[PDB]
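User: Need the bound-state model for UEY:
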Amino acid sequence: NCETSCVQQPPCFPLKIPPNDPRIKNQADCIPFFRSCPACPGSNITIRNQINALTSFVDASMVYGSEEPLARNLRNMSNQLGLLAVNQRFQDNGRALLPFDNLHDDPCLLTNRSARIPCFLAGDTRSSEMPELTSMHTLLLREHNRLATELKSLNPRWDGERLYQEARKIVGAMVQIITYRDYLPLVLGPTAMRKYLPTYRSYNDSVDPRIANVFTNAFRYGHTLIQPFMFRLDNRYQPMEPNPRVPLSRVFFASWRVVLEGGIDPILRGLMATPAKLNRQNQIAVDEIRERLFEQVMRIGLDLPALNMQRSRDHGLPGYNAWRRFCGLPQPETVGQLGTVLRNLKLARKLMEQYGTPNNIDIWMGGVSEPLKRKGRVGPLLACIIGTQFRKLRDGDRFWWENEGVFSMQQRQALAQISLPRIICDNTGITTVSKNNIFMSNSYPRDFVNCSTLPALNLASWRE
Amino acid sequence: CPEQDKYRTITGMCNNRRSPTLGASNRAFVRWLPAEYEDGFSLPYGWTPGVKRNGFPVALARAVSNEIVRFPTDQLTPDQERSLMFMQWGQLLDHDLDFTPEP
Ligand code: HEC
Ligand SMILES: *[C@@H]1O[C@H](CO[C@@H]2O[C@@H](C)[C@@H](O)[C@@H](O)[C@@H]2O)[C@@H](O)[C@H](O)[C@H]1NC(C)=O
Ligand SMILES: Nc1cc([C@H](Cc2ccccc2)c2ccccc2)c2nn[nH]c2n1
Ligand SMILES: *[C@@H]1O[C@H](CO)[C@@H](O)[C@H](O)[C@H]1NC(C)=O
Ligand SMILES: *[C@@H]1O[C@H](CO)[C@@H](O)[C@H](O)[C@H]1NC(C)=O
Ligand SMILES: [Ca+2]
Ligand SMILES: [Cl-]
Ligand SMILES: [Cl-]
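Assistant: Bound-state model below.
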């Protein structure tokens, strides 16, 4: 019983409490932790490895599902319109909300006892983890139904299966385009983008597209970008009174806020017109996730950065220097050498005080401590792990949107004009959205434009 | 794998015709380096009291977090060149790529 016990017995690997902890004064207590499911349980032959429950491809599986029974339950099958099922109890100003899930122990009901709003049901189980994530899932649900509705009027003989698949294929390509054209360049910076993601040529069936074990921990760099509040803005992009800056430890699993506190529009406005938190070597991750993660739905607040480190040990991941060696980067052995790699002798001294050797620094810890590459938000090690992963997902994907045969030349040219600000225009009541690049633009009104200036996806090439 | 297909499967099966589970759901992660466990095959570093990792004591993950990650919330530095949508797309994208189940 990991949730409540401090005893180290499989499958529990609880995080112990150091002396003089700033929050947890009881040293007989602990931070709960379940070891990830082994791929080969009970074995004394195989070296323990972990499982990926999702498709590695950028195929909008967080929208459509990664298992066939769930994917059927996500669709509206009462007609031939190829739609995704929508919430039958509530609407967001006339617009669709995700269906509710039927969870035995629902954590969303714990966030507001009197509201009685359960978790949402989407392609991925974590959709209600924060209302900002729910907003993104809800936006893509509306985009699928909008696409299946336009395709039905354009091609009336197409049946529900054709309509679902054709709208699914477009949403998947949209997720690939936003990710590779707009998102990844801003993560890696220009030089690592050129190095790890050179111009796409064609599909290569010898490229292994699986997620590497280390990537599940290295991609947690995103924790350093998390702001301590959920920001909501009104029609004029001003704070939505009287709760415009709700602390993050009061939004985790708070599906009731989407349903009862103005829908997804105030949230999507806040994501667009509020800056991200910058990762600094002395300002790595906020206490809303470091001290109060899931506080309302659990016996104790969790430490997300500490869980990331315990998870890398649980996953048997090698240390900082082995990953530096894997990446073809120098491996510092003394405090002075680590100081030069990090351009920070003070941080290197503290890392040495904890670990003794740079060989033992946990991959997330070492990765997020590196100075940021120019025009990117990760350093040399993380850019290598992340770039290598994303190149394998693109080159090793037979259904990659630019692969010959996937879309027609005319369809590829129409898809090239998509953008996240335009998807917000089409599926929300928001009339003023960020200018491209949406991931850079963060100040209203300077970085904003009207819906009327951004052209919509032209589905003419999809006519049979 | 059917010889001709127009759309992806839901599970990712049949994307790679020569190795049809590659990228498919509910499969073990690939490893880029061999795993490092206390006993070589199963126990994580930090499991057994007194067992050092490569010559040094294993540090408590919570102690690393307290001494390196911790910072005063009011001293947060906003990113002048990134929106909060940059963070949010990352989590949404992560949820398209991997989910590691626990018991
Ligand atoms: C851009 C990257 C990124 C962002 C942003 C992000 N995460 Fe993470 N997070 C990950 C990845 C990757 C994992 C590992 C997922 C897996 O494979 O199970 C993860 C894992 C987690 C876990 C599991 C911790 C464990 O025990 O190992 C929690 C909890 C979590 N994230 C919470 C959050 C919260 C809360 C948010 C914000 C609302 C968030 N994450 C935003 C990438 C991110
Ligand atoms: C197809 O890809 C094969 C695998 O290559 C490796 O992975 C890709 C993603 C790159 O990072 C590459 O540098 C790696 O070597 C190669 O064996 C094969 O030669 C490639 N073929 C063509 C024609 O590109
Ligand atoms: N691999 C994960 C797991 C979760 C939680 C479970 C959890 C893990 C550790 C500590 C506490 C609770 C989850 C939330 C909602 C549904 C399923 C799972 C995540 N929430 N955001 N990102 C996440 N990544
Ligand atoms: C299915 O579609 C019809 C037509 O739009 C709608 O009235 C119905 O509520 C939908 N059902 C679900 C479960 O979304
Ligand atoms: C819970 O939601 C209700 C709205 O139905 C609101 O009145 C109440 O104040 C909320 N409770 C808390 C503690 O936020
Ligand atoms: Ca996927
Ligand atoms: Cl319902
Ligand atoms: Cl690995």
